[PDB]
Symmetry: C3
């Protein structure tokens, strides 16, 4: 899948799909 670790809500074609971290802080994993 194509995924991004996001500061913001998942993009329209994406779904919240797990957990990642940005600088050690929990963040949305967004996948399409």
């Amino acid at each position: 899948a194509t995924c991004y670790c996001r500061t913001g809500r998942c993009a329209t074609r994406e779904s919240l799909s797990g957990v990642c971290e940005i600088s050690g802080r929990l963040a949305r994993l967004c996948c399409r």
Copy 2:
């Protein structure tokens, strides 16, 4: 629900209910 992100054990009327972070370190989510 009423929840707090705790350094300590959940208070008496609270239950461990998920995961949060305090300054980027995993911590207890306590809810009542």
Copy 3:
């Protein structure tokens, strides 16, 4: 169980068994 919070893959006799943190960054929990 005997567990370690690892930067690397779990050792041969170990299995990935949960999540821990090293300096506030998610890491493998490896247990045997």
